[PDB]
Design a protein around this ligand. Sequence first.
Ligand SMILES: NC(=O)c1ccc[n+]([C@@H]2O[C@H](COP(=O)([O-])OP(=O)(O)OC[C@H]3O[C@@H](n4cnc5c(N)ncnc54)[C@H](O)[C@@H]3O)[C@@H](O)[C@H]2O)c1
Ligand SMILES: NC(=O)c1ccc[n+]([C@@H]2O[C@H](COP(=O)([O-])OP(=O)(O)OC[C@H]3O[C@@H](n4cnc5c(N)ncnc54)[C@H](O)[C@@H]3O)[C@@H](O)[C@H]2O)c1
Lengths: 330, 330
Amino acid sequence: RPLVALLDGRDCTVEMPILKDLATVAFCDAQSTQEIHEKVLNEAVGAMMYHTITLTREDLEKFKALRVIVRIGSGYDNVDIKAAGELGIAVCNIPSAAVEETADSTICHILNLYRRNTWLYQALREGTRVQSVEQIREVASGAARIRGETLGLIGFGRTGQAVAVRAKAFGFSVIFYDPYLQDGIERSLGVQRVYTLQDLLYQSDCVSLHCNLNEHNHHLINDFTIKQMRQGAFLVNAARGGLVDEKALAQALKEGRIRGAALDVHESEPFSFAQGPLKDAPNLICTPHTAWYSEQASLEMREAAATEIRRAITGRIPESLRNCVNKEFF
Amino acid sequence: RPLVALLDGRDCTVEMPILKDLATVAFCDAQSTQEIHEKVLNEAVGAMMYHTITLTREDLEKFKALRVIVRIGSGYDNVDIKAAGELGIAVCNIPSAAVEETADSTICHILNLYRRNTWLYQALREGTRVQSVEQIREVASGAARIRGETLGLIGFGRTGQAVAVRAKAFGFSVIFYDPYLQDGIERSLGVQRVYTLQDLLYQSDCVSLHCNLNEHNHHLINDFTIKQMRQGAFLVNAARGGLVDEKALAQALKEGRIRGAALDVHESEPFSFAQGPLKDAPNLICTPHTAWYSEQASLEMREAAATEIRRAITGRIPESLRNCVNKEFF
Ligand SMILES: NC(=O)c1ccc[n+]([C@@H]2O[C@H](COP(=O)([O-])OP(=O)(O)OC[C@H]3O[C@@H](n4cnc5c(N)ncnc54)[C@H](O)[C@@H]3O)[C@@H](O)[C@H]2O)c1
Ligand SMILES: NC(=O)c1ccc[n+]([C@@H]2O[C@H](COP(=O)([O-])OP(=O)(O)OC[C@H]3O[C@@H](n4cnc5c(N)ncnc54)[C@H](O)[C@@H]3O)[C@@H](O)[C@H]2O)c1
């Protein structure tokens, strides 16, 4: 009775009942390929994984029985999907369990930068006494009127579109760059499109990343491209950490070129304020990779990922799969 | 000789040039009526004030020459407007310079409660290491899916309407209670209206205050009315401290009856985390009365307040005044 392994997790309680009758389900709690037990490498027919482990070409070669990998989540940058396909392994994601969570979190980050809600809380926790009106304007200095500001989205897929839909009512003028989209989405949703990243950076008061990390967009925001942003612009990144060169950003924040940054994701996670290139960088908001999370979203995606494995066993791979991201399979 | 005094401020630089040619402008920097210099009491024809000082009946009687009071801001709970009118003193506000600023800040608070952005930032500042996916769920525990939740607005005026316009796109179902509004606003803006406070509290997952503080709504949210709210509801107050009995809220938070509260305003300002009935209360966000502030908003309202004073001198009081809130005048 086929083995299905949950690679980088301990909890397996949603997935077991959905698959009890078809497969033996197990967890590895492996943070790296080295830690995966020999039995799983040899016999596992299916694997489920989060974002905290990476499977390279060499790693995927170590599995002697694997037929399908399912990412519990939308992102699949952490799996070499081209090597997977060449070795006869289908890779799937769960693209839509946490769209709205993520947009909501993104807007929250934007609003926190514009209205300084998080920093004002911090100022009070640090014990600042704000009595007079002059002191209010001092403490809240930089809090800005949103109406008229331009919000620039890099990547206008599921999360990007979701953010756009929320930004309009605050008076943001929304603009996007996505060089892979077909013509027309801009017209449907009544937003403006630009056709180079430079245009987007030149025109945006707040730039937010919503593109998937791929072969061609590592360090999209880098030493060069940051200099193309407006003086005193805002940067928001709830997409993936490798999209941003944190050394570049660090300097930009120190020199005032970027007024502030809000990051849910980082080059090196888990994030710490004591460590890394952003060590002593001012005007930084960070959260620990939570944009996706809600009780309801977590359950939805686990259930969906169990269902996908179920399809892979009962049907034919890759035709039966709902969300297979690698038809350069076989 | 006309004297115009800025009662509770030091900064006078926007107002002087607008009034240079008509009146002498002066500032008191008084935090209480006792601190206002004898000259201002005797000769001041006009006064401008913020929210940090109060004028009672007794206080207003000490002015031997005052004809007009202008609140730089929309709130006028801190001035006995009926006493003012009876003593021949017109009271005006600036009702619309900071509507969108406030709604933006309000939504930011709402989203901070639902997505825990500020508390996750705090958890990172405190040095929490969030490595595994299980640790992400743990630290972000309580982060909730918004779509489907009901947002209940108490007071559906300028700020309330502005929050409703923003909430829709997140999937909130918006409900309101405002017993002074005429029939029909509900229909115009496509939101539902309830006709008692109890019905609003019963049906709301998140309750947000947007009513002006008046004779009849002090401690609107009190020991009795909090018990009418749903188990695990959220409370947001960017309207006025005084609307909420902080002793009652404090116990509610400790007992879990309210899942979290975000307050920009407090019974006793300036707020401190070391002091008051909320001293050791869990799941609290507070900002130090900033919801109104932006560089652009602050300028607009000071300029408007100066222009109102200008009308009072040049024209007949109260007819020439744009936003006079007390026709029980003379
Ligand atoms: N922080 C979180 O918890 C969280 C949650 C969900 C998703 N995400 C991240 O956000 C990403 C986007 O999510 P999604 O479901 O909306 O993806 P999606 O498939 O719906 O959209 C991504 C878009 O990015 C575009 N794109 C790729 N490279 C680009 C580039 N260099 N410049 C501009 N556009 C580019 C693509 O064409 C695509 O339309 C995911 O891949 C994931 O990494 C993060
Ligand atoms: N946080 C801030 O710095 C900030 C900024 C602006 C306004 N405010 C406060 O918000 C309040 C409202 O602002 P606004 O400009 O929208 O005023 P508004 O006059 O346009 O709205 C007030 C509404 O609340 C209603 N209301 C009064 N008493 C009520 C009650 N007891 N129960 C339910 N509804 C009631 C009124 O009928 C009216 O429709 C003011 O008191 C103001 O001080 C705070």
